[PDB]
Amino acid sequence: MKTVITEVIASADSQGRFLNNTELQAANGRFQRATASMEAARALTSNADSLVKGAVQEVYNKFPYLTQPGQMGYGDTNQAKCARDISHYLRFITYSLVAGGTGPLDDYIVAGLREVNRTFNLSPSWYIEALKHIKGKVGSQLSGQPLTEANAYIDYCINALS
Amino acid sequence: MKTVITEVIASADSQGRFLNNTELQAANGRFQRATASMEAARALTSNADSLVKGAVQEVYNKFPYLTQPGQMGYGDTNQAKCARDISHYLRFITYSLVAGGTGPLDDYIVAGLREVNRTFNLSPSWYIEALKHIKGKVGSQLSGQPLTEANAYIDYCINALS
Amino acid sequence: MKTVITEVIASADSQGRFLNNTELQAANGRFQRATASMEAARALTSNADSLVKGAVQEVYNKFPYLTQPGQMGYGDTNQAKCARDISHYLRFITYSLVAGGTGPLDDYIVAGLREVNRTFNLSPSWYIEALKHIKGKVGSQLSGQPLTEANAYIDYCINALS
Amino acid sequence: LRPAVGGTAEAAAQKQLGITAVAPASVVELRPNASEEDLQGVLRAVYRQVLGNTYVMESERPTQAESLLRNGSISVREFVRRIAKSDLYKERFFNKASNNRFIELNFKHLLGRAPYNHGEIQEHFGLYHKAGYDVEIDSYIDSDEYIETFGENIVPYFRGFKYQTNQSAGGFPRMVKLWGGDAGSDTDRGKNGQRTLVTTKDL
Amino acid sequence: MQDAFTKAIVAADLRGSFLSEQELNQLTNLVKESNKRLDAVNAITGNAAEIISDAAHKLFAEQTDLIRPGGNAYPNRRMAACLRDMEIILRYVSYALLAGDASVLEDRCLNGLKETYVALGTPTRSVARAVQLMKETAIGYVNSPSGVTRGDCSALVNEAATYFDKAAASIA
Amino acid sequence: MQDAFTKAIVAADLRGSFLSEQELNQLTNLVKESNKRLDAVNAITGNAAEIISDAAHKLFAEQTDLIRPGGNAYPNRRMAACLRDMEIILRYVSYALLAGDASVLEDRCLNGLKETYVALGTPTRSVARAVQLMKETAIGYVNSPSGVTRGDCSALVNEAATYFDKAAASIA
Amino acid sequence: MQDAFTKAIVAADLRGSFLSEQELNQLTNLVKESNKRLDAVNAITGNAAEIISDAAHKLFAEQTDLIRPGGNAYPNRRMAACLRDMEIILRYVSYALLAGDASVLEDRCLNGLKETYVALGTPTRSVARAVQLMKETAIGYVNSPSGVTRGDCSALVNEAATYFDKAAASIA
Amino acid sequence: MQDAFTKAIVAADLRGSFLSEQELNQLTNLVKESNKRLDAVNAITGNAAEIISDAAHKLFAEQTDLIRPGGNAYPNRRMAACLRDMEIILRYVSYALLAGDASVLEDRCLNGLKETYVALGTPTRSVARAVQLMKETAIGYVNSPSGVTRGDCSALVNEAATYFDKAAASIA
Ligand SMILES: *[C@H](C)[C@H]1/C(=C/c2[nH]c(/C=C3N=C(/C=C4\NC(=O)C(CC)=C4C)C(C)=C\3CCC(=O)O)c(CCC(=O)O)c2C)NC(=O)[C@@H]1C
Ligand SMILES: *[C@H](C)[C@H]1/C(=C/c2[nH]c(/C=C3N=C(/C=C4\NC(=O)C(CC)=C4C)C(C)=C\3CCC(=O)O)c(CCC(=O)O)c2C)NC(=O)[C@@H]1C
Ligand SMILES: *[C@H](C)[C@H]1/C(=C/c2[nH]c(/C=C3N=C(/C=C4\NC(=O)C(CC)=C4C)C(C)=C\3CCC(=O)O)c(CCC(=O)O)c2C)NC(=O)[C@@H]1C
Ligand SMILES: *[C@H](C)[C@H]1/C(=C/c2[nH]c(/C=C3N=C(/C=C4\NC(=O)C(CC)=C4C)C(C)=C\3CCC(=O)O)c(CCC(=O)O)c2C)NC(=O)[C@@H]1C
Ligand SMILES: *[C@H](C)[C@H]1/C(=C/c2[nH]c(/C=C3N=C(/C=C4\NC(=O)C(CC)=C4C)C(C)=C\3CCC(=O)O)c(CCC(=O)O)c2C)NC(=O)[C@@H]1C
Ligand SMILES: *[C@H](C)[C@H]1/C(=C/c2[nH]c(/C=C3N=C(/C=C4\NC(=O)C(CC)=C4C)C(C)=C\3CCC(=O)O)c(CCC(=O)O)c2C)NC(=O)[C@@H]1C
Ligand SMILES: *[C@H](C)[C@H]1/C(=C/c2[nH]c(/C=C3N=C(/C=C4\NC(=O)C(CC)=C4C)C(C)=C\3CCC(=O)O)c(CCC(=O)O)c2C)NC(=O)[C@@H]1C
Ligand SMILES: *[C@H](C)[C@H]1/C(=C/c2[nH]c(/C=C3N=C(/C=C4\NC(=O)C(CC)=C4C)C(C)=C\3CCC(=O)O)c(CCC(=O)O)c2C)NC(=O)[C@@H]1C
Ligand SMILES: *[C@H](C)[C@H]1/C(=C/c2[nH]c(/C=C3N=C(/C=C4\NC(=O)C(CC)=C4C)C(C)=C\3CCC(=O)O)c(CCC(=O)O)c2C)NC(=O)[C@@H]1C
Ligand SMILES: *[C@H](C)[C@H]1/C(=C/c2[nH]c(/C=C3N=C(/C=C4\NC(=O)C(CC)=C4C)C(C)=C\3CCC(=O)O)c(CCC(=O)O)c2C)NC(=O)[C@@H]1C
Ligand SMILES: *[C@H](C)[C@H]1/C(=C/c2[nH]c(/C=C3N=C(/C=C4\NC(=O)C(CC)=C4C)C(C)=C\3CCC(=O)O)c(CCC(=O)O)c2C)NC(=O)[C@@H]1C
């Protein structure tokens, strides 16, 4: 998984060199950001049930037809799959916060996303609408550098879906 | 583009060989099919205006929301762009019939399709619904080997969108 | 083995694509030619014993020295090897007719031909004289498209020897 | 007239070994004024050969590099060197693997053959330790072997499974240990991870 | 690669003989049914995306485990690779159906597959289940095409069935 | 690559129009004469070795200097390269004759040829004379095939002539 | 690659769960002691050449046989390779100390090392002795850096010790 | 690579000693017979095509099966490969005769040859028979060179014999 620490080590290994002050400075940056990142991660974890339920309902408000019969939103299995998917997104966002890189999100969600979504006919727009809902609620929960960290990982997902 | 003739020539060139009976037999298959393919192409050309009008209306029936304000189906510009796009699809289908390959469809439509559709937020499902409408109407207009040819090129598009 | 069918499959596999109308049209050309090709193949098979005898004799008339002692024509083993070789040529021509490609001839005869002929001091001109004798006799036996098919595979060999 | 008793067909050995698609491997050349269809063929060939039939998701495609190839700003040879220096290559074949495994992977990917002797291992391990990864990858791409066979426009293809001029005898059995099949790959994503197929004991 | 015609001549060569009249007759019969064969190959190609999608939905409904965390089809990377594999197998079955011989499937697609799956830890029996689901969908399309002249396609359907079955047997 | 059909489509696309009935008619005529075209392509392929040899004999009789020491064909290596070039040109002309368009000849063979020859020091006018000699031999084979149905092949002969002439003009 | 944080995420993912408070606490403690860790990594890098040199001198005093003719360190080429190996192992131990996980050491350095050594005829027990000699030197530098704030580094030293010990156990 | 001189040095190095006068004397004897050795290497190179041809004729007379349909030297592709292999082995024997040591033959030709043949399904015993047939032809040329000073070449002939014999024993 890409993190600040793995990336500096990988670079050094490619050059075949011992880690220098250049790498260690980068490493220090990761460890300082960690306090804000942890704060974000704890808050997202604490509100995760509420965040997901609101997110799913927002998708249904934004696209009313999904809930209508013969549509992807209709039926318990379909609705359950929605809540599962948004929960995955939150989980991988909190993992990325704690890891100090986008690598968790990249390996679990971003790779293969487009192919999967095409085959199953899952619209990127539904997910993007849910993530944007989350971003609004998180903004109420967190402030300052915690908030900045949270917003960046949510934005990474939104851009990958886009 | 890809046609039977270009493909046999390309194969021979790759092996650095003069064209042999193997290639010429393949070529003869293209020239025999040409009569059915031409008949299909003429019929699609004659009904192209009507085919496009019906196809666009079908999309609006299948997804009623699009027609509502703030949606992609709404407004003259948007509706005009729909008719343009479906017309393009027909034009490249008739070209493919005459060319004796899917190459015209591949170079004009299929290449870059996914990236374009993503950026402009154009759903593959709208196009697929229009193509399927056309396929039904073509079935009334053509029979036998002409019909077989037509259906194959419409199906190629549908699979590429899918 | 190069045939129309293997060549279309190979092309599709290289592109990583399903067989489309382009390939199927080519395939249809192979199956239509098959009736002429079969007729040729049956005629060559029926007269194969006589064709070989006349071919071997023609070489001896064309190159009288070979029959004289200390020469490649002289002796039972040498004459038997001649009849064997011409028989091989006819056999692989009939195989190529039935296969719908030059592939049988290419793998069995053409590949390695030059190196083998050099090492064993076998003149390409002897074989070419035999093939041309066959071509004249076949011309009496076959007409029209059967004749055209036969002539193409005999000519392929003549060019490979040349 | 009577046939040979054993009586295999030509190609029987290739059929039996499962090298039937690669023993005489098809050669793909990027040509001038290449069509879009033609360029896509070359790219597929490159990814299969250079990345060891591992899957590449659409997010991983280089795209900017392909822009150059389409333009003619770079040759197939330069494109191959960019892929081999890329993190797509490094992640699979280099970061998890040992040098011993990395070196033989490079021969298969770039040269199309197995390492012929322990001296090739000694040379490339030595280069890496003195000059790091990029210099190493350059060695294969900038080598008489590369340049004479593929040159600039030909995509690398599998040369082993056929006799090459300076080949050692150990070369063909070693290619058999490196080739898993058409469906094989050289994938980091396994239970055991990247292990050495060709031991020092072998070399 | 091999096709039905190529297979017959290779056999005749090992006997060292001109193709027999019986062998010729069998080949002639293949030519007579070639139109139907072309129609069958068309049916698979025309519905290829539908075949894979329908199979995928059925597989994941049957086996929830694969899509859960810890499953081989989780996460998106793996799911994508799974769908890629299904498409590859279908492509090679269609190739084999045009050839009239299973060698193309065996030599390229099937070769090394079980070893790959064992290394990955992919469950082979699930892969086999996927191939069976694809088979049922595909055969339906062949059996019920639009605009095709009615006749008996039973022999072609049976041949298609065997190619699917070969793939399944190899994988597990 | 391009062929006659593909060329017409590209033109119509730039107009953004469905192919016109006149354009369709031209294409229909190409299909109508396709058997004659196939015969002509066969004649060149079937006599390819003879065409090159007969041209080579005539060229070296006309220009004794090339084969003398100091001539461009003078070591065996150079003579071999000369014969290779003649084979390549004939190959591409035959490709163009099947395609019905000279694009393949221009794009792969002819582009940069004169520049390469000038750098090498190969005499371009002699290369052109070789292409003209090949043309006369080739046309003879097309004009007198054995067992072909008697008919007028004049348009196809003229088309072949133009492809030879294009090659000659580019090289020179 | 894996680091301490990455390892915890992977575990939680297999459970399909958000990181637990206990898991979070462990990670937070690693962040809290990160300054000490950075100082220790710096000590190895800053003294890297001395660590290897001091070890090498001690190894060759202990084992005269390696440097005599017939020893594995005996021509200059082999001596150079021995010194190269010591530097590589030290590099990977230092990487592991920054990561907080031994994976990097295992995945590149340790995998197949014993097999390679046995094939070469390198004596594995001596290689292990070299790793122990490096350990004593390296730990001394970590334990006594100059101008660092006085503090207890014992946990970090123990972690470093384990990485050295892993390498030794694999090799021998 | 290794030669007779290089082999002696390597031995003395492992003892860590200067080459002894007796060892020097052996090397001097090799230098003394070097003209004869050069003539022997010349005889093989000068008659190389004849050696292979004469062997091949004898092999195919002895083993009719190889050249019959289905045989390992049938058809032309396989026959060509067989002749290529014979030439490669002869090349390496000639290299070894100049070197005065079999290592080049062992390291590059012989190691893995048997494995290759077994994988291919080539009959190793026939390959070995081919090497014996080549030996008889080659030795004849060495024994009767044209215009060379008359002398006893028997020791060199025996050395050549051993290299052929090693190759045969490895392959079989
Ligand atoms: C919610 C916004 C909408 C919705 C979603 C929904 N999803 C599926 C099916 C799938 N969802 C995924 C997604 C993931 N799988 C992963 O491994 C990851 C990364 C960790 C994600 C995010 C997948 C792969 C599937 C397809 C296979 C499966 O069933 O698991 C469906 C069902 C589609 C189907 O027919 O298969 C639905 C409906 N549900 C709603 O109502 C919203 C509109
Ligand atoms: C019809 C089903 C729906 C619809 C469509 C619509 N399309 C666009 C925009 C584009 N359409 C295309 C497609 C093509 N361009 C080509 O070059 C070809 C191949 C030759 C095709 C088929 C493109 C590229 C665009 C984007 C650029 C452009 O504007 O030309 C729009 C507007 C998209 C936007 O938001 O900007 C629309 C709405 N309209 C409807 O009513 C249906 C829902
Ligand atoms: C007939 C025109 C002349 C002739 C023939 C002759 N042939 C050979 C030897 C060989 N011929 C072949 C040919 C083939 N073997 C194959 O596998 C195939 C493809 C299926 C072919 C076409 C080969 C390989 C040989 C060499 C091996 C062998 O002996 O079988 C000879 C013997 C040459 C020698 O010096 O050994 C002869 C004499 N003889 C005549 O009377 C004609 C002049
Ligand atoms: C889907 C039905 C099941 C599934 C599939 C799955 N496959 C892989 C990985 C690979 N699949 C292949 C297969 C092929 N490559 C080819 O070119 C061919 C044809 C010649 C085949 C059939 C390959 C080579 C790989 C491994 C290398 C790679 O990275 O692609 C995976 C990924 C496993 C992983 O751990 O990442 C998966 C998931 N798995 C299931 O559970 C489904 C039942
Ligand atoms: C079997 C899978 C189903 C079926 C097949 C079927 N097809 C025909 C007849 C024809 N099939 C074709 C089609 C093609 N010819 C080509 O050149 C190509 C590739 C470009 C195709 C796809 C043709 C030309 C014919 C003959 C003319 C016609 O349209 O009838 C039949 C009729 C019998 C025959 O073999 O002639 C049949 C039975 N029909 C079914 O009911 C099956 C479900
Ligand atoms: C023969 C009629 C005349 C002749 C020819 C000649 N050509 C060369 C060398 C080259 N010729 C080419 C040309 C081509 N290469 C291609 O790929 C194509 C199609 C695009 C062609 C037609 C090239 C590239 C070379 C140089 C590289 C090579 O030889 O492979 C020579 C040799 C010149 C030299 O000194 O190397 C000759 C002699 N020369 C005559 O005098 C004839 C009239
Ligand atoms: C012009 C070069 C000479 C000529 C040509 C000519 N050809 C035909 C007829 C046919 N030619 C073919 C040949 C092929 N069809 C194929 O499928 C292949 C490749 C596998 C070939 C080579 C065929 C099938 C025919 C039609 C059947 C027939 O035998 O007539 C004609 C007849 C009329 C027509 O225009 O097709 C003619 C005139 N005739 C000459 O005199 C020229 C010297
Ligand atoms: C020094 C303490 C001891 C010693 C070392 C020694 N090593 C070699 C040769 C090699 N060592 C390696 C090691 C690695 N391969 C890897 O991938 C890694 C991690 C990335 C390492 C550390 C390798 C590959 C070789 C073989 C290739 C080469 O020699 O370059 C030797 C040389 C032995 C020989 O005969 O070639 C030696 C001497 N030997 C001792 O005696 C010391 C106790
Ligand atoms: C243990 C190895 C020895 C030791 C370490 C120790 N260090 C600190 C404090 C700090 N260490 C650093 C160093 C760095 N931070 C960076 O960003 C980099 C790389 C770019 C380095 C090298 C820093 C910033 C501090 C804090 C400032 C300070 O001077 O205190 C301590 C104090 C505890 C703490 O974690 O803050 C200690 C104990 N000291 C010993 O006695 C050990 C032998
Ligand atoms: C001739 C006396 C016998 C014979 C030979 C034969 N060999 C092959 C194929 C191969 N031969 C080799 C051998 C070498 N590779 C090496 O590295 C060396 C020396 C260092 C040798 C001698 C190789 C690698 C191959 C495979 C590659 C290739 O085919 O080019 C064949 C062909 C087998 C096939 O079916 O392809 C044959 C026939 N066979 C006989 O019958 C004779 C006894
Ligand atoms: C043994 C294989 C047969 C034989 C050999 C033989 N040669 C000589 C003498 C000489 N051989 C050469 C030849 C060469 N010297 C070179 O530099 C080269 C390569 C460039 C060759 C080929 C020379 C120079 C001599 C000496 C001068 C001379 O002509 O005598 C002898 C004589 C003894 C000796 O070598 O001093 C012999 C015996 N003669 C036989 O009877 C064997 C069948």
mmCIF file of N, CA and C in Angstrom, chain E residues 17-62:
data_model
loop_
_atom_site.group_PDB
_atom_site.id
_atom_site.type_symbol
_atom_site.label_atom_id
_atom_site.label_comp_id
_atom_site.label_asym_id
_atom_site.label_seq_id
_atom_site.Cartn_x
_atom_site.Cartn_y
_atom_site.Cartn_z
ATOM 1 N N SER E 17 -0.697 -41.400 -45.811
ATOM 2 C CA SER E 17 -1.608 -41.743 -46.889
ATOM 3 C C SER E 17 -2.393 -40.519 -47.351
ATOM 4 N N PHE E 18 -2.870 -40.567 -48.588
ATOM 5 C CA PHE E 18 -3.863 -39.637 -49.091
ATOM 6 C C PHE E 18 -5.142 -39.790 -48.266
ATOM 7 N N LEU E 19 -5.835 -38.676 -47.990
ATOM 8 C CA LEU E 19 -7.068 -38.719 -47.210
ATOM 9 C C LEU E 19 -8.003 -39.738 -47.859
ATOM 10 N N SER E 20 -8.612 -40.577 -47.000
ATOM 11 C CA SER E 20 -9.527 -41.629 -47.425
ATOM 12 C C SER E 20 -10.871 -41.030 -47.831
ATOM 13 N N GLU E 21 -11.627 -41.776 -48.648
ATOM 14 C CA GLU E 21 -12.907 -41.278 -49.140
ATOM 15 C C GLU E 21 -13.881 -41.066 -47.978
ATOM 16 N N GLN E 22 -13.784 -41.949 -46.978
ATOM 17 C CA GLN E 22 -14.547 -41.815 -45.751
ATOM 18 C C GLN E 22 -14.178 -40.522 -45.035
ATOM 19 N N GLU E 23 -12.885 -40.226 -44.919
ATOM 20 C CA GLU E 23 -12.445 -39.006 -44.252
ATOM 21 C C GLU E 23 -12.930 -37.799 -45.041
ATOM 22 N N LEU E 24 -12.846 -37.886 -46.374
ATOM 23 C CA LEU E 24 -13.311 -36.807 -47.222
ATOM 24 C C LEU E 24 -14.796 -36.550 -46.961
ATOM 25 N N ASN E 25 -15.576 -37.639 -46.875
ATOM 26 C CA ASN E 25 -17.011 -37.520 -46.686
ATOM 27 C C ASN E 25 -17.332 -36.797 -45.381
ATOM 28 N N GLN E 26 -16.612 -37.119 -44.313
ATOM 29 C CA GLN E 26 -16.863 -36.471 -43.034
ATOM 30 C C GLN E 26 -16.635 -34.974 -43.179
ATOM 31 N N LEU E 27 -15.564 -34.586 -43.885
ATOM 32 C CA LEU E 27 -15.230 -33.181 -44.043
ATOM 33 C C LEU E 27 -16.304 -32.475 -44.860
ATOM 34 N N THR E 28 -16.816 -33.161 -45.878
ATOM 35 C CA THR E 28 -17.850 -32.599 -46.732
ATOM 36 C C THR E 28 -19.107 -32.304 -45.909
ATOM 37 N N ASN E 29 -19.409 -33.169 -44.934
ATOM 38 C CA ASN E 29 -20.550 -32.980 -44.058
ATOM 39 C C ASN E 29 -20.363 -31.730 -43.188
ATOM 40 N N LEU E 30 -19.130 -31.477 -42.752
ATOM 41 C CA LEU E 30 -18.846 -30.269 -41.996
ATOM 42 C C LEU E 30 -19.116 -29.017 -42.834
ATOM 43 N N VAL E 31 -18.800 -29.075 -44.126
ATOM 44 C CA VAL E 31 -19.012 -27.961 -45.020
ATOM 45 C C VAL E 31 -20.510 -27.744 -45.209
ATOM 46 N N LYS E 32 -21.285 -28.827 -45.256
ATOM 47 C CA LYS E 32 -22.721 -28.675 -45.455
ATOM 48 C C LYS E 32 -23.405 -27.964 -44.281
ATOM 49 N N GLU E 33 -22.892 -28.148 -43.068
ATOM 50 C CA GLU E 33 -23.511 -27.577 -41.882
ATOM 51 C C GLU E 33 -22.849 -26.248 -41.485
ATOM 52 N N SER E 34 -22.003 -25.691 -42.368
ATOM 53 C CA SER E 34 -21.174 -24.544 -42.037
ATOM 54 C C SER E 34 -21.991 -23.266 -41.824
ATOM 55 N N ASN E 35 -23.112 -23.137 -42.528
ATOM 56 C CA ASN E 35 -23.973 -21.972 -42.387
ATOM 57 C C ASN E 35 -24.520 -21.922 -40.964
ATOM 58 N N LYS E 36 -25.011 -23.054 -40.471
ATOM 59 C CA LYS E 36 -25.531 -23.146 -39.122
ATOM 60 C C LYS E 36 -24.434 -22.856 -38.115
ATOM 61 N N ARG E 37 -23.236 -23.344 -38.364
ATOM 62 C CA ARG E 37 -22.140 -23.087 -37.464
ATOM 63 C C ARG E 37 -21.854 -21.594 -37.401
ATOM 64 N N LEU E 38 -21.915 -20.899 -38.536
ATOM 65 C CA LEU E 38 -21.625 -19.474 -38.581
ATOM 66 C C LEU E 38 -22.698 -18.710 -37.813
ATOM 67 N N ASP E 39 -23.943 -19.146 -37.948
ATOM 68 C CA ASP E 39 -25.038 -18.563 -37.199
ATOM 69 C C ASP E 39 -24.836 -18.757 -35.693
ATOM 70 N N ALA E 40 -24.382 -19.932 -35.259
ATOM 71 C CA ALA E 40 -24.145 -20.170 -33.853
ATOM 72 C C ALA E 40 -23.057 -19.263 -33.317
ATOM 73 N N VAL E 41 -21.965 -19.099 -34.060
ATOM 74 C CA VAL E 41 -20.875 -18.256 -33.596
ATOM 75 C C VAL E 41 -21.368 -16.823 -33.486
ATOM 76 N N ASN E 42 -22.248 -16.428 -34.403
ATOM 77 C CA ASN E 42 -22.815 -15.091 -34.396
ATOM 78 C C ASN E 42 -23.629 -14.860 -33.114
ATOM 79 N N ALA E 43 -24.401 -15.865 -32.711
ATOM 80 C CA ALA E 43 -25.258 -15.741 -31.544
ATOM 81 C C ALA E 43 -24.456 -15.476 -30.273
ATOM 82 N N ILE E 44 -23.308 -16.127 -30.143
ATOM 83 C CA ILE E 44 -22.509 -15.931 -28.950
ATOM 84 C C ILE E 44 -21.894 -14.540 -28.990
ATOM 85 N N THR E 45 -21.338 -14.147 -30.134
ATOM 86 C CA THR E 45 -20.661 -12.865 -30.248
ATOM 87 C C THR E 45 -21.638 -11.720 -30.028
ATOM 88 N N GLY E 46 -22.833 -11.858 -30.595
ATOM 89 C CA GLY E 46 -23.818 -10.802 -30.539
ATOM 90 C C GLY E 46 -24.343 -10.588 -29.129
ATOM 91 N N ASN E 47 -24.324 -11.642 -28.303
ATOM 92 C CA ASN E 47 -24.876 -11.569 -26.968
ATOM 93 C C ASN E 47 -23.781 -11.700 -25.909
ATOM 94 N N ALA E 48 -22.530 -11.424 -26.263
ATOM 95 C CA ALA E 48 -21.435 -11.810 -25.386
ATOM 96 C C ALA E 48 -21.482 -11.096 -24.033
ATOM 97 N N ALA E 49 -21.746 -9.794 -24.055
ATOM 98 C CA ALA E 49 -21.802 -9.008 -22.830
ATOM 99 C C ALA E 49 -22.953 -9.473 -21.949
ATOM 100 N N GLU E 50 -24.079 -9.841 -22.548
ATOM 101 C CA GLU E 50 -25.229 -10.319 -21.807
ATOM 102 C C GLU E 50 -24.930 -11.667 -21.160
ATOM 103 N N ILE E 51 -24.228 -12.544 -21.890
ATOM 104 C CA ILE E 51 -23.929 -13.863 -21.383
ATOM 105 C C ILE E 51 -23.103 -13.706 -20.122
ATOM 106 N N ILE E 52 -22.052 -12.892 -20.175
ATOM 107 C CA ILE E 52 -21.176 -12.757 -19.019
ATOM 108 C C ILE E 52 -21.915 -12.105 -17.864
ATOM 109 N N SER E 53 -22.680 -11.069 -18.146
ATOM 110 C CA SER E 53 -23.378 -10.368 -17.085
ATOM 111 C C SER E 53 -24.356 -11.307 -16.395
ATOM 112 N N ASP E 54 -25.120 -12.073 -17.172
ATOM 113 C CA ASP E 54 -26.142 -12.918 -16.590
ATOM 114 C C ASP E 54 -25.504 -13.975 -15.693
ATOM 115 N N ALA E 55 -24.373 -14.518 -16.144
ATOM 116 C CA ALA E 55 -23.645 -15.512 -15.395
ATOM 117 C C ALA E 55 -23.125 -14.899 -14.107
ATOM 118 N N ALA E 56 -22.530 -13.718 -14.206
ATOM 119 C CA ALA E 56 -21.938 -13.067 -13.049
ATOM 120 C C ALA E 56 -22.991 -12.839 -11.967
ATOM 121 N N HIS E 57 -24.166 -12.354 -12.364
ATOM 122 C CA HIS E 57 -25.209 -12.109 -11.388
ATOM 123 C C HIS E 57 -25.587 -13.401 -10.686
ATOM 124 N N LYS E 58 -25.677 -14.498 -11.433
ATOM 125 C CA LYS E 58 -26.105 -15.756 -10.868
ATOM 126 C C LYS E 58 -25.038 -16.300 -9.956
ATOM 127 N N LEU E 59 -23.773 -16.154 -10.337
ATOM 128 C CA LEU E 59 -22.698 -16.705 -9.540
ATOM 129 C C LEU E 59 -22.681 -16.045 -8.168
ATOM 130 N N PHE E 60 -22.788 -14.717 -8.145
ATOM 131 C CA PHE E 60 -22.622 -13.970 -6.916
ATOM 132 C C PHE E 60 -23.851 -14.113 -6.039
ATOM 133 N N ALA E 61 -25.006 -14.422 -6.633
ATOM 134 C CA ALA E 61 -26.188 -14.726 -5.838
ATOM 135 C C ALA E 61 -26.056 -16.092 -5.173
ATOM 136 N N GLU E 62 -25.524 -17.073 -5.907
ATOM 137 C CA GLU E 62 -25.307 -18.415 -5.391
ATOM 138 C C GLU E 62 -24.265 -18.384 -4.277
#
